Short mmCIF file of C-alpha atoms in Angstrom, two decimals:
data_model
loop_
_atom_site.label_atom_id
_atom_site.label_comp_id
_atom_site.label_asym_id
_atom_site.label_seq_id
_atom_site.Cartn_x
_atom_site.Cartn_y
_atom_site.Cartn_z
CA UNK A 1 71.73 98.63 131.02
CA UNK A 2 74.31 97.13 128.50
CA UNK A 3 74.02 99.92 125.86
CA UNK A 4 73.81 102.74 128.97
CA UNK A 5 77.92 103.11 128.28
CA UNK A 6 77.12 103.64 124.14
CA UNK A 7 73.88 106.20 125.48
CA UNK A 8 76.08 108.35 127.86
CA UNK A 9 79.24 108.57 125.57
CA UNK A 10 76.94 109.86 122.87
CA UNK A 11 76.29 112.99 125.18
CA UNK A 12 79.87 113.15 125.89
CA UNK A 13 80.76 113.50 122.13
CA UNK A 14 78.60 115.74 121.33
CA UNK A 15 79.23 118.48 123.75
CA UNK A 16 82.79 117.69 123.81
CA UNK A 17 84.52 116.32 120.90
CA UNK A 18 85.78 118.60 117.97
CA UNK A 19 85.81 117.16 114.21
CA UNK A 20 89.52 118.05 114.38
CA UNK A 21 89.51 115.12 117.44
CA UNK A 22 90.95 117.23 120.38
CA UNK A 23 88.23 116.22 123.45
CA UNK A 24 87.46 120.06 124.60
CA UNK A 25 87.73 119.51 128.75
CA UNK A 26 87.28 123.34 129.52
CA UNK A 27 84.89 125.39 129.72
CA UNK A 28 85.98 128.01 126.81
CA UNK A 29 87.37 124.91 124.47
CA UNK A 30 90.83 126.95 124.06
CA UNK A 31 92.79 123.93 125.75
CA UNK A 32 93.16 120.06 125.99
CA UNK A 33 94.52 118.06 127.87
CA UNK A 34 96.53 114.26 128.14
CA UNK A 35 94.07 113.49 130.48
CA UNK A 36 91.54 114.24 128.29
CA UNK A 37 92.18 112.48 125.31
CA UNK A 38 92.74 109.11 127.30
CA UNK A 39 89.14 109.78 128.61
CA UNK A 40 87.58 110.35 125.79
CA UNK A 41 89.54 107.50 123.73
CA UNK A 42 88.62 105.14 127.02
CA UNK A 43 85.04 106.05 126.60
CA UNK A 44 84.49 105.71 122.72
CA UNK A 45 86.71 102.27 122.69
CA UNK A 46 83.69 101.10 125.37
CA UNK A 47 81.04 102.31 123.68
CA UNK A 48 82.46 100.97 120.13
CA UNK A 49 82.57 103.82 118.68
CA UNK A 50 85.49 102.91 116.27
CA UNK A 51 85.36 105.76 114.06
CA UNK A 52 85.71 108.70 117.39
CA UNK A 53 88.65 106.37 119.25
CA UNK A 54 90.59 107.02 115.77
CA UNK A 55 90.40 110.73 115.46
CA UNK A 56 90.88 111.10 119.33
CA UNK A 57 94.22 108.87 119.00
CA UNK A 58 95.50 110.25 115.55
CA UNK A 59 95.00 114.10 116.99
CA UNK A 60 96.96 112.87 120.35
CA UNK A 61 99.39 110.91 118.60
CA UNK A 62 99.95 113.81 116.13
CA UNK A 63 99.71 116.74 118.82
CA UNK A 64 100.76 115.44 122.63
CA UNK A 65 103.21 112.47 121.85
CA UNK A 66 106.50 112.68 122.68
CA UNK A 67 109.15 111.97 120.22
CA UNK A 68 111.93 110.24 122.24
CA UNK A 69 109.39 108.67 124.31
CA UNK A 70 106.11 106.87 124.11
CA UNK A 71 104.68 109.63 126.98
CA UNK A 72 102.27 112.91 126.29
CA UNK A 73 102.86 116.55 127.06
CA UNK A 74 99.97 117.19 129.31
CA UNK A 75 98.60 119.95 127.60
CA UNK A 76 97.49 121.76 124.63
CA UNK A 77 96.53 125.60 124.20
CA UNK A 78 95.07 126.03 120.81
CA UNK A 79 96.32 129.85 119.19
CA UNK A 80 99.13 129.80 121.36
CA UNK A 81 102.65 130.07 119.24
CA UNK A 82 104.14 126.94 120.63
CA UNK A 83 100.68 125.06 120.94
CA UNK A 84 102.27 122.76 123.55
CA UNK A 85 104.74 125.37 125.31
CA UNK A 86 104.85 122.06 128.11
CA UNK A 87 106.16 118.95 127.37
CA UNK A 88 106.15 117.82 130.90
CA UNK A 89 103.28 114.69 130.82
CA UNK A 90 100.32 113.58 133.74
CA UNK A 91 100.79 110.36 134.38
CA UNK A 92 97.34 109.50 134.46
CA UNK A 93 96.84 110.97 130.89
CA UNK A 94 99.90 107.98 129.71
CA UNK A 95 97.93 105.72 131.65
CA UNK A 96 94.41 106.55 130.13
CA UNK A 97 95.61 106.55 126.80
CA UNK A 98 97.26 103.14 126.84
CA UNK A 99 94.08 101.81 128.99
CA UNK A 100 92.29 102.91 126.01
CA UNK A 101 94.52 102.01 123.40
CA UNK A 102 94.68 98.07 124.52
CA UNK A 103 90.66 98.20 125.06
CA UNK A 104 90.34 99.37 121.59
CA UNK A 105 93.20 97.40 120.36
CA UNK A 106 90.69 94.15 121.64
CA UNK A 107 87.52 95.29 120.45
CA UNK A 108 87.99 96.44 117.20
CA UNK A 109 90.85 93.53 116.46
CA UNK A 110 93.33 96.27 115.70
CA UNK A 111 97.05 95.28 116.45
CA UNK A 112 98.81 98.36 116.21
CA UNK A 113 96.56 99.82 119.09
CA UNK A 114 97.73 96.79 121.30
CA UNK A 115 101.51 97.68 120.24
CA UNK A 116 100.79 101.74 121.24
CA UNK A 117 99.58 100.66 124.17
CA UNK A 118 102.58 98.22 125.19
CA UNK A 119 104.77 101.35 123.67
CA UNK A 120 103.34 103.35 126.15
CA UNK A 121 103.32 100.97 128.96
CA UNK A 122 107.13 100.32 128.09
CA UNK A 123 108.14 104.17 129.15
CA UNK A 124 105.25 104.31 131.75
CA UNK A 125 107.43 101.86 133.43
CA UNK A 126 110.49 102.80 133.08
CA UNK A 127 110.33 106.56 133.65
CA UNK A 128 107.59 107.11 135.92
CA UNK A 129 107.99 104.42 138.33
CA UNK A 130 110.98 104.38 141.43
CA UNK A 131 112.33 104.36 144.76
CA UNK A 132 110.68 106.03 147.78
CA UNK A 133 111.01 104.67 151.49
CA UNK A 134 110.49 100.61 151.21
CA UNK A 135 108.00 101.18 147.89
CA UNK A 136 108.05 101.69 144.24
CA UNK A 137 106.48 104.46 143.47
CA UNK A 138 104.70 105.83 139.92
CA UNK A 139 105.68 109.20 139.88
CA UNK A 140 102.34 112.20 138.60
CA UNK A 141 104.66 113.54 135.90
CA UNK A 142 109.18 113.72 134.63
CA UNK A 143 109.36 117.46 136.50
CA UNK A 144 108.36 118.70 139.85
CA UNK A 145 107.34 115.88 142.17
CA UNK A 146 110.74 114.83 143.37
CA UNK A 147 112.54 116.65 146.15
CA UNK A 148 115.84 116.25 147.89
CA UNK A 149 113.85 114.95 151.10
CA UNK A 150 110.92 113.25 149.58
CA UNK A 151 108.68 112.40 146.60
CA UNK A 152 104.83 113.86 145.31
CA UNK A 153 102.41 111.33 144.31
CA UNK A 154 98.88 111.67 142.88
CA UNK A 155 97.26 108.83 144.15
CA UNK A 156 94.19 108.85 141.85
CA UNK A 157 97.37 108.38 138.95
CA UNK A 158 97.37 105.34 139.64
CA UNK A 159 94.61 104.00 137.26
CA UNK A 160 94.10 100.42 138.68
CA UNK A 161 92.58 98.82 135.12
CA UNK A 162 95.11 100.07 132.79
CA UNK A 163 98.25 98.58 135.48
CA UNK A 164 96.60 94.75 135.43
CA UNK A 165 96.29 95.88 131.53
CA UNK A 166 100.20 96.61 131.25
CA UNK A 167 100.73 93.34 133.29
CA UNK A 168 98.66 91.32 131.21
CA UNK A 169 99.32 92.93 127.71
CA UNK A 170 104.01 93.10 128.50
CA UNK A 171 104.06 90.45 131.47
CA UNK A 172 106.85 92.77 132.75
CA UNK A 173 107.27 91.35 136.66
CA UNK A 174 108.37 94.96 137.87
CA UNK A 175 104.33 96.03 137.57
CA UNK A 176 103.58 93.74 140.18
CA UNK A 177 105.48 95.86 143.04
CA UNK A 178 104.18 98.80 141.62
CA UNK A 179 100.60 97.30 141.88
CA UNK A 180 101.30 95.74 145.33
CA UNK A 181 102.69 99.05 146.36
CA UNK A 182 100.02 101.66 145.31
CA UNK A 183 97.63 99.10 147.64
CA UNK A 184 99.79 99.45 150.55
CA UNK A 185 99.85 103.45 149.74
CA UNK A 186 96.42 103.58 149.56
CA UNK A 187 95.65 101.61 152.92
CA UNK A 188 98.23 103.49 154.93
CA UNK A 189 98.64 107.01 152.80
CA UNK A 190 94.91 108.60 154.40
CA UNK A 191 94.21 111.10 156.68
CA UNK A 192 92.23 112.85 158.97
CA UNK A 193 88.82 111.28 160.95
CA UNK A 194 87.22 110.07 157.56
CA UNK A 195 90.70 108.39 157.04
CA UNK A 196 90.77 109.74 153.37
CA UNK A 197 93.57 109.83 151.15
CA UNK A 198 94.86 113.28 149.79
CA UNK A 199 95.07 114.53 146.52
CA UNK A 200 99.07 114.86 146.63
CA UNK A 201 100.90 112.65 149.04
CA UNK A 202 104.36 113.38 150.61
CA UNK A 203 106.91 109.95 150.96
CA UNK A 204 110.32 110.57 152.67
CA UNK A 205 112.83 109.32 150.94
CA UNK A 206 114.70 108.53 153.16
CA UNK A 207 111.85 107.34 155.92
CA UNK A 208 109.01 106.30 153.78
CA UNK A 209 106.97 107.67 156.07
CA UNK A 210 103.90 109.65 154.61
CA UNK A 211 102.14 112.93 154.62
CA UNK A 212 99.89 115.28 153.16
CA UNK A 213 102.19 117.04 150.34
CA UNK A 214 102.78 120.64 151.30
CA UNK A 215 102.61 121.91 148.04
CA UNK A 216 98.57 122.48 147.55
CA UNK A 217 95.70 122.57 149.89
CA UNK A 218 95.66 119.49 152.68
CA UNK A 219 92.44 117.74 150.68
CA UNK A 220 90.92 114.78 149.57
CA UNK A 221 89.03 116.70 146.59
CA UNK A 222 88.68 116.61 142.39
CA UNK A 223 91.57 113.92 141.87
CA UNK A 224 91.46 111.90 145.28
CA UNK A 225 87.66 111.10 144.22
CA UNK A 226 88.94 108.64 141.69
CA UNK A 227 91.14 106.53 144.07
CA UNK A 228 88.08 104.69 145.63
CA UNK A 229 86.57 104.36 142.25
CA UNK A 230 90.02 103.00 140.27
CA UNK A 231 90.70 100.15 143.03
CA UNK A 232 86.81 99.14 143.10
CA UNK A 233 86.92 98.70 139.52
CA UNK A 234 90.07 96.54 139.57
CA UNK A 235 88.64 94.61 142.60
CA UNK A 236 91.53 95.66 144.56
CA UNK A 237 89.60 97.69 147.22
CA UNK A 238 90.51 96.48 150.53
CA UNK A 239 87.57 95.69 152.85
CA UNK A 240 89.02 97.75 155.67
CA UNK A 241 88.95 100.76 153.32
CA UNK A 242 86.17 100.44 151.75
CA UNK A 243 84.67 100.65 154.90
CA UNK A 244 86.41 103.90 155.83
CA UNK A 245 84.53 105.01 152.61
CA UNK A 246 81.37 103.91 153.37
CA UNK A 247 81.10 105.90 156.74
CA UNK A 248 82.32 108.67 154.69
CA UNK A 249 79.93 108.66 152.36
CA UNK A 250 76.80 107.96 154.53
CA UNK A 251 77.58 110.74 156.98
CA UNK A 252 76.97 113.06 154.39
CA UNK A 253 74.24 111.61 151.74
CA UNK A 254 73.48 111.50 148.26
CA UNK A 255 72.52 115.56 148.55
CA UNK A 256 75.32 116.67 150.15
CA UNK A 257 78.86 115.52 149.57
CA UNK A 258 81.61 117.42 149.69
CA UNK A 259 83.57 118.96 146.94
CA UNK A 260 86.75 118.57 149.04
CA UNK A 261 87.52 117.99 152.88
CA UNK A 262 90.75 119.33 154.33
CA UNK A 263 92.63 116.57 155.86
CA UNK A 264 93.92 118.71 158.96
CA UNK A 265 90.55 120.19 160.23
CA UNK A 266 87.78 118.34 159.06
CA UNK A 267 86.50 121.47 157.28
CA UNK A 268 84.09 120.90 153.90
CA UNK A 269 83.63 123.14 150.80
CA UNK A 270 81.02 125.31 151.29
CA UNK A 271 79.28 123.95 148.18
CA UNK A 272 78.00 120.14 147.07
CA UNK A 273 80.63 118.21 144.67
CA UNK A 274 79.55 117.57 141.52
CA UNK A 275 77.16 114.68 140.23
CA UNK A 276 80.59 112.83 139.53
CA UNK A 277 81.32 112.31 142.99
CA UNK A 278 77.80 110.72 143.78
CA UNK A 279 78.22 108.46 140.82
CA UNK A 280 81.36 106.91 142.60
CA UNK A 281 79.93 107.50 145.83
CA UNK A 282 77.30 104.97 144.63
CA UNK A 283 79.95 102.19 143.20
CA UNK A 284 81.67 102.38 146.87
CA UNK A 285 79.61 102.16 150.14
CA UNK A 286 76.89 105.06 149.07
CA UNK A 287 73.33 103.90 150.63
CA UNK A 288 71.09 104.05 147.25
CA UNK A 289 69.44 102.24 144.50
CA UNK A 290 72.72 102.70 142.00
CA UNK A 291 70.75 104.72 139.57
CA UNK A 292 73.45 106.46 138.46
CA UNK A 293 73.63 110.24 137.44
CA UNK A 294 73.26 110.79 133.59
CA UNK A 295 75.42 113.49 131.10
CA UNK A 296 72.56 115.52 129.60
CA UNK A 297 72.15 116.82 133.79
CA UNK A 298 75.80 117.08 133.60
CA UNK A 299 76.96 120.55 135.02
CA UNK A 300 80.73 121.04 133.21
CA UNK A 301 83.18 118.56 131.78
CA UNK A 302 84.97 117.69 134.89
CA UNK A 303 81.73 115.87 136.11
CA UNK A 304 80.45 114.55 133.10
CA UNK A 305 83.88 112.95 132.70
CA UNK A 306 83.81 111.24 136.08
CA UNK A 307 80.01 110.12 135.43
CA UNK A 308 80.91 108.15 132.28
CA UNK A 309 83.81 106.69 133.76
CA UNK A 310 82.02 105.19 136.54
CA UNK A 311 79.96 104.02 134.03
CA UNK A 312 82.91 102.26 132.51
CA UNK A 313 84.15 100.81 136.06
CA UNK A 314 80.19 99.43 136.90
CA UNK A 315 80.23 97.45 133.14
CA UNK A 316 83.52 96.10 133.19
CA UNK A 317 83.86 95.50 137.20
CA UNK A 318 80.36 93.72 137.30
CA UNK A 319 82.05 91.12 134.73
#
């Protein structure tokens, strides 16, 4: 359905985006997040919805930019005295943004979006992206993933479109190694008998070698779910592990996948993920028709969210 991105994103801004243009992605609407904004700004530049992409950038522009760099503090807590008490950014949330930013910047033949998003790409580059092992990593955020003895990632961070976008939009050679290494990460950076890849992974420094990061539970759960989905959509999904997530996906079907599995013991969550899940589930080895899940069945933000953006991947992957 061509207009099935413009139908879902009109759900999406209805029960989530305020006049003031912060993209509410919590249940009580007291917070909002990098993350958020890029989403929201991704799915109104798709949907060409000019007049939503513009409040969503001017309130993250105004309220999570960075001054001495082109990044966003990950989060904002509306009534609290310092608003944005974090400046520390997500770099998924840089990444959406700037995805956004140069789809909108096309679409609606606006120039200054396609500068933003080089702006961003510029410091995405240069300050999220080093040395771990034999690869060049993209760091999840400035503070906190880097150790003496090794380096965090977030795989699902790396958000496959808006990379080949920064290539194509700044020509800067250095994304190709970053590219060409966040395949090789996600080919050898899985775990356990489904052979998934974690939320946080763990690269010695030193070694390179790679493990499930010790810091949270040892799952592939509510950010590894996008890995399969980002790589699909930039038809940069190796066959080998697309496979792996095929038998995945079919051991479980359409009415019961997991929230999470832990990596170590094979255990599930003792509920079914959300809609989300089976919408990417369907774009990557899922047995089914590929009617996807729609918002107004939506249960929270977090799966509406995902839904739309596999909506996003399926109209811009199909070509």
């Amino acid at each position: 359905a061509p207009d099935a991105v413009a139908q879902q994103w009109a759900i999406f801004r209805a029960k989530y985006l305020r006049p003031s243009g912060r993209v509410v992605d919590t249940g009580n609407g007291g917070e909002s997040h990098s993350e958020g904004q890029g989403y929201g700004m991704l799915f109104a530049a798709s949907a060409g919805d000019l007049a939503s992409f513009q409040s969503m950038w001017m309130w993250a522009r105004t309220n999570l930019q960075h001054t001495n760099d082109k990044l966003f503090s990950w989060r904002f807590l509306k009534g609290h005295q310092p608003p944005v008490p974090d400046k520390n950014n997500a770099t998924d949330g840089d990444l959406l943004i700037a995805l956004a930013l140069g789809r909108a910047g096309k679409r609606f033949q606006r120039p200054d979006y396609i500068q933003d998003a080089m702006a961003i790409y510029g410091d995405v580059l240069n300050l999220m992206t080093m040395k771990a092992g034999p690869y060049v990593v993209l760091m999840p955020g400035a503070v906190g993933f880097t150790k003496k003895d090794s380096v965090i990632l977030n795989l699902s961070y790396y958000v496959m479109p808006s990379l080949l976008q920064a290539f194509d939009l700044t020509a800067d050679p250095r994304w190709r190694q970053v590219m060409e290494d966040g395949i090789r990460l996600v080919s050898a950076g899985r775990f356990g008998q489904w052979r998934l890849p974690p939320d946080w992974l763990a690269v010695n420094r030193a070694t390179g070698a790679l493990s499930i990061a010790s810091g949270w539970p040892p799952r592939f759960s509510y950010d590894a779910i996008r890995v399969p989905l980002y790589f699909y959509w930039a038809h940069m999904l190796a066959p080998n592990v697309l496979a792996d997530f095929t038998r995945f996906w079919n051991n479980f079907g359409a009415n019961a996948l997991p929230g999470w599995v832990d990596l170590t013991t094979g255990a599930r969550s003792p509920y079914n993920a959300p809609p989300g899940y089976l919408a990417v589930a369907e774009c990557t080895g899922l047995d089914s028709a590929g009617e996807l899940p729609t918002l107004d069945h939506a249960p929270d933000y977090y799966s509406a969210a995902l839904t739309l953006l596999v909506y996003i991947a399926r109209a811009e992957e199909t070509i």
